Design a protein around this nucleic acid. Structure first.
Ligand SMILES: [Mg+2]
Ligand SMILES: [Mg+2]
Ligand SMILES: [Mg+2]
Ligand SMILES: [Mg+2]
Ligand SMILES: [Mg+2]
Ligand SMILES: [Mg+2]
Ligand SMILES: [Mg+2]
Ligand SMILES: [Mg+2]
Ligand SMILES: [Mg+2]
Ligand SMILES: [Mg+2]
Ligand SMILES: [Mg+2]
Ligand SMILES: [Mg+2]
Ligand SMILES: [Mg+2]
Ligand SMILES: [Mg+2]
Ligand SMILES: [Mg+2]
Ligand SMILES: [Mg+2]
Ligand SMILES: [Mg+2]
Ligand SMILES: [Mg+2]
Ligand SMILES: [Mg+2]
Ligand SMILES: [Mg+2]
Ligand SMILES: [Mg+2]
Ligand SMILES: [Mg+2]
Ligand SMILES: [Mg+2]
Ligand SMILES: [Mg+2]
Ligand SMILES: [Mg+2]
Ligand SMILES: [Mg+2]
Ligand SMILES: [Mg+2]
Ligand SMILES: [Mg+2]
Ligand SMILES: [Mg+2]
Ligand SMILES: [Mg+2]
Ligand SMILES: [Mg+2]
Ligand SMILES: [Mg+2]
Ligand SMILES: [Mg+2]
Ligand SMILES: [Zn+2]
Lengths: 155, 129, 151, 25, 144, 87, 81
RNA sequence: AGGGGAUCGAAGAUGAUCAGAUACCGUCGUAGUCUUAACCAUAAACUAUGCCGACUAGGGAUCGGGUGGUGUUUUUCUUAUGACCCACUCGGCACCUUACGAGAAAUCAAAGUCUUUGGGUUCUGGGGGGAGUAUGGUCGCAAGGCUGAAACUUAAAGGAAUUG
RNA sequence: AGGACUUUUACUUUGAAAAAAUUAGAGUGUUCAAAGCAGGCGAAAGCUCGAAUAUAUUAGCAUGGAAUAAUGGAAUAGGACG
RNA sequence: CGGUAAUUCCAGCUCCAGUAGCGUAUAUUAAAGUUGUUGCAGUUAAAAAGCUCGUAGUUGAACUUUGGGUCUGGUUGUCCG
RNA sequence: GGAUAGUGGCCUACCAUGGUUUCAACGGGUAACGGGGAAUAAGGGUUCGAUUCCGGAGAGGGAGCCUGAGAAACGGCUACCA
């Protein structure tokens, strides 16, 4: 779901105010800026050496992670550059002393540095309002597959 | 299907006590049944039981002495906060001088008085008196 | 005594002997028993028939007692486990047989209900074999797929 | 009265009302 | 063991089962549907004024032989018409035709009381003054 | 049962069934109390000296009275092998 | 009946009860060593066999499937295992 | 709709009985009953007892299966079967006695193990009538089925059993 | 106090939090009480104790526990260590 | 209750209950184990879908260190200083 | 990119076709402002909460705006409707 071209749209895609000097003869790939979101969260090497842009990247973009940290399960990875996470919980009805299974759908913005798919449990972090509904940035794909790490059977 | 095995065990104990017998044969014989009968032994409501290995869930043979009058599980193992222990004892036990709400705390399966002594509480298993 | 899809209450079964280890009187070799299992599987026999052959014609009480592994486990270790599990395959065969009987005579409604029952059982077993990932997640049951798998 | 015949009388009232509605539908 | 579920995660169906069963009551159904506001002669009103239209008496039931002296009153708050009962020996003559009369409930939760058919309302005040003060000659009708 | 100073406040601490350990009700008008006379060396029933077993009305109604008495007499050395502990 | 041993019931009562209902459940079946008059090979067979078991040397059946246990071939001599 | 078309028989035709009798008794008698396709989805569709699971009490029988008999007739000389007899076991429609348990009782071996109240789970009821009516959906060619109140009225309606 | 890996929960103990008024409740002769947060004691020459506590049963945060209940490991070894 | 002897209507006497308060109307709570999670009933009183399959929901067999010995810290009831 | 004090489909341009839902979404009703709380009281609860405190909204119904740090103010203006 990611275009091969590093910039695909009409506007140019650059990290604002990080400049690579063309007159210089170092001729490294580019000058890519990055940061660590803290909380003992490892920045992915796919973001470290990657070539995407993703204005709203917790690791490379301007957005900062602060506030709530929510763990959930991916219910929809199939809309562009964003994720829909199913968070399940038990509401405690006290008149019966009984619990009640309930679910909420939290939109978030997964960076291209992560490879997500339906069913992955994801640790996500609070940030600024990114869109009308997304307020969280995907920070870790804990379960990449879960039960699909081993697929084939060849003794 | 057998959902709550301890329920079957305590029902068998109750039936074989009401008829006046002194022994029970409980078939499935889980951990929880062993701990429950061990607590009853510690408090005297039961006699000398026995685990019979079958390599398949085992079984238990329970000896009684007529001292017990009713077992019983609280089938939904309600989360019992330390404040709600007294309410359960009032609603279940017949008198404050005796009876024991056997409940499973993180410190093991224990009678309600012992749990109150440890100042710890968890889910409720059943009641004996 | 449940009888998932009927009102039966039977308990006719077999009681596995208490002793897990090999019987005292058995003189055969575990490696020879494994070789026999392999040969029977190569003949084109499902694990249940392999077990019945080992119990009847030979002194093998059960494979796990003698070798330490189960029959299907032994076959899988040697890569002879069928792509469809035996019970599901037999359910598929039964379902296709009843569907053939139905399409050869429409008015029989009792066999229609029995086909519904068999299809429900097939769906349940397929769901189980799918959550354990024995079958691919896209595996399913429709018409003309049962015939293809059976044939 | 029997529930059977009360039912039948209701059905005949519905007879007349259904015919009237069908005429004026 | 019982019809209701007992699991620790069965709060939802227990709550909705209770909510669906609550409609079997009459008080709860009346309170939630709001039948009192829409259909009853008064909407959640203990008392209501009205204008006397005519002056009728109604015979009683079978075991009780008499004619209870009522009065037909058209309510002023909305325009409904209801029969109401003047409670005492000599109070019929006290209320005159076409005067404002304050009707109250009949005490049986909006249902006919005793042997009086098709009535559900007392008469407490007439022309601003109460019946009980007139009956013991403590006050007199202003006659306006 | 016990007052705090230490005196009994209960009245008629009741008997219990000698076979099922259950108490005997005051109006349990089915229960019995068997007396078995002690026997000396030459088979003379010693008077005023015996052993008593209180059988409850419940077991008598059920039909286990004679079996319970058999077991209870065998335990205290009255009857020789009349009751087998393994059925 | 009120007092009774279940840990050590009589072996006669053990053979009395059904399989799957003993203290520990044990099969009532057993194996047999059969000899066919043909050759001297000793064949190990099951009491409740389900197939027409034959000696590998000669195509002669030694048992016969039956709703219960095996019925032998009228000439084979067996010994209980 | 197509096929048949014996019997019996809604409607109908009458002959009786009666004060009336287009009801019961009787004789004929279409539709229907019998079928191949397509609808219908309702019954006192009842065991008026939801399903799965455990335990609790004694007595025989009965059906299907399986074990053993030093058993009996069988006859194919003996045996193998089969058919019985005895004992046991599993499963099923059931049944007798009893309360030591439960019920308002009639009664129930489950309608027991429920104020000593919690094995899992689905559906339904909150006095009677209005009323399974109207309306609004939905299914049906139609018949009608599913869902389904209120206004209002009423002090009872109802269950079991006791004596007349 | 720093890199390093963190199976995840449900549950439960403790604490920080849940504004005051209200409820509970301590002290206090408003003449008693509803109340109020007052008051008390000197020799009469300024000296004073107060304005206590608990609960809120959900959501969030921290914390100790590991029975009960759930999920995950190593089966093609692509497993664990040196 | 009231049909010629009204302990019930209208009055007089006596008495009763609360008392500067008492009576009525509607609403609501406890009574209501007549909303029942604790805690309701379904054979006949109202109420087990005609039966079966089945997604969601609810629930779901047993098993994975239990023992011991010592030292030692608080808290008790100990015997007495 | 514009606007915003500032994030933000808040608006525009071009793209993608997506987001919620039997764990009740959406719609309908509320003689519904939310809460702290009130009545009631074995325990569990049921009903109420317009109003002495905290929030929100409104000044006949609607829109629009100047001044300022703060108003879409109404004991401030502009216009329509009544
Ligand atoms: Mg008259
Ligand atoms: Mg025709
Ligand atoms: Mg006729
Ligand atoms: Mg005639
Ligand atoms: Mg006729
Ligand atoms: Mg004829
Ligand atoms: Mg019906
Ligand atoms: Mg029915
Ligand atoms: Mg009703
Ligand atoms: Mg009806
Ligand atoms: Mg309609
Ligand atoms: Mg009757
Ligand atoms: Mg507060
Ligand atoms: Mg106070
Ligand atoms: Mg008089
Ligand atoms: Mg009821
Ligand atoms: Mg009836
Ligand atoms: Mg009925
Ligand atoms: Mg039914
Ligand atoms: Mg499901
Ligand atoms: Mg378990
Ligand atoms: Mg409003
Ligand atoms: Mg308010
Ligand atoms: Mg409110
Ligand atoms: Mg208002
Ligand atoms: Mg305010
Ligand atoms: Mg304003
Ligand atoms: Mg105004
Ligand atoms: Mg200023
Ligand atoms: Mg304005
Ligand atoms: Mg003004
Ligand atoms: Mg102002
Ligand atoms: Mg101005
Ligand atoms: Zn041979």
């Amino acid at each position: 779901s990611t275009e091969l071209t590093v910039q695909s749209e009409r506007a140019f895609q650059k990290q604002p105010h990080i400049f690579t000097n063309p007159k210089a003869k170092a001729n490294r790939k580019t000058k890519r800026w990055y940061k660590n979101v803290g909380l003992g969260f490892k920045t992915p090497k796919t973001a470290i050496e990657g070539s995407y842009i993703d204005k709203k990247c917790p690791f490379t973009g301007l957005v900062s992670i602060r506030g709530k940290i929510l763990t959930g399960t991916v219910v929809s990875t199939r809309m562009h550059r964003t994720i829909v996470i199913r968070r399940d919980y038990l509401h405690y009805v006290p008149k019966y002393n009984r619990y009640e299974k309930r679910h909420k759908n939290v939109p978030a913005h997964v960076s291209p540095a992560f490879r997500v798919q339906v069913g992955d449990i994801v640790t996500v972090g609070q940030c600024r309002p990114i869109s009308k509904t997304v307020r969280f940035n995907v920070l870790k794909v804990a379960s990449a597959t879960g039960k699909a790490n081993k697929q084939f059977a060849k003794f | 299907t057998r959902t709550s095995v301890l329920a079957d065990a305590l029902n068998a104990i109750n039936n074989a006590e009401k008829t006046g017998k002194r022994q029970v044969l409980i078939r499935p014989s889980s951990k929880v049944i062993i701990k429950f009968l061990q607590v009853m032994q510690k408090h005297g409501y039961i006699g000398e039981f026995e685990y019979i290995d079958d390599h398949r869930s085992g079984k238990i043979v329970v000896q009684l002495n007529g001292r017990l009058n009713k077992c019983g599980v609280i089938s939904p193992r309600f989360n019992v906060k330390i404040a709600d222990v007294e309410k359960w004892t009032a609603n279940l036990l017949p008198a404050r001088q005796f009876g024991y709400v056997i409940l499973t705390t993180s410190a093991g399966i224990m009678d309600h008085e012992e749990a109150h002594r440890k100042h710890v509480s968890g889910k409720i298993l059943g009641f004996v008196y | 005594m449940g009888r998932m899809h009927s009102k039966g209450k039977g308990m006719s079964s077999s009681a596995i002997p208490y002793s897990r280890n090999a019987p005292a009187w058995f003189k055969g070799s575990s490696d020879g028993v494994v070789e026999q299992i392999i040969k029977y599987a190569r003949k084109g026999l499902t694990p249940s028939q392999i077990g019945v052959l080992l119990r009847d014609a030979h002194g093998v009480t059960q494979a796990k007692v003698i070798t330490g592994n189960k029959i299907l486990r032994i076959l899988k270790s040697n890569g002879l486990a069928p792509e469809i599990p035996e019970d599901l395959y037999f359910l598929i065969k039964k379902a296709v047989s009843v569907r053939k009987h139905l399409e050869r005579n429409r008015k029989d409604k009792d066999a229609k209900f029995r086909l519904i029952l068999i299809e429900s059982r097939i769906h349940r077993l397929a769901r189980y074999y799918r959550t354990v990932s024995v079958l691919p997640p896209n595996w399913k049951y429709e018409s003309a797929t049962a015939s293809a798998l059976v044939n | 009265m029997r529930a059977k015949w009360r039912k039948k009388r209701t059905r005949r009232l519905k007879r007349k009302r259904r015919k009237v509605r069908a005429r004026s539908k | 063991g019982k019809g209701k579920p007992r699991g620790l995660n069965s709060a939802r169906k227990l709550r909705v089962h209770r909510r669906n069963n609550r409609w079997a009551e009459t008080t709860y159904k009346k309170r939630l549907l709001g039948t009192a506001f829409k259909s009853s002669p008064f909407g959640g009103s203990s008392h209501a004024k009205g204008i006397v239209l005519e002056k009728i008496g109604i015979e009683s039931k079978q075991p009780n032989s008499a004619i209870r002296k009522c009065v037909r009153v058209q309510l002023i708050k909305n325009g409904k018409k209801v029969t109401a009962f003047v409670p005492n020996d000599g109070c019929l003559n006290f209320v005159d035709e076409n005067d404002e009369v304050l009707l109250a409930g009949f005490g049986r939760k909006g249902k006919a009381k005793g042997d009086i058919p098709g009535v559900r309302f007392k008469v407490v005040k007439v022309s601003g003054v109460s019946l009980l003060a007139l009956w013991k000659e403590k006050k007199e009708k202003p006659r306006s | 049962m016990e007052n705090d100073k230490g005196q009994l406040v209960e009245l008629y601490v009741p008997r219990k069934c000698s076979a099922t350990n259950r108490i005997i009700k005051a109006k349990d008008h089915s229960s019995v109390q068997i007396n078995i006379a002690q026997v000396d060396e030459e088979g003379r029933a010693i008077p005023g000296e015996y052993v008593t077993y209180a059988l409850s009305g419940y077991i008598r109604a059920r039909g286990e009275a004679d079996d319970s008495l058999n077991r209870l007499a065998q335990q205290d050395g009255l009857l020789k092998n009349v009751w087998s502990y393994s059925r | 009946v009120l007092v009774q041993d279940l840990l050590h019931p009589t072996a006669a009562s053990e053979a009395r009860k059904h399989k799957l209902k003993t203290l520990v459940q044990s099969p009532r079946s057993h194996f047999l060593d059969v000899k066919c008059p043909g050759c001297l090979n000793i064949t190990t067979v099951f009491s409740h066999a389900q197939t027409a078991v034959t000696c590998e040397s000669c195509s002669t059946v030694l048992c016969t499937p039956t709703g219960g246990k095996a019925k032998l071939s009228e000439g084979t001599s067996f010994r209980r295992k």
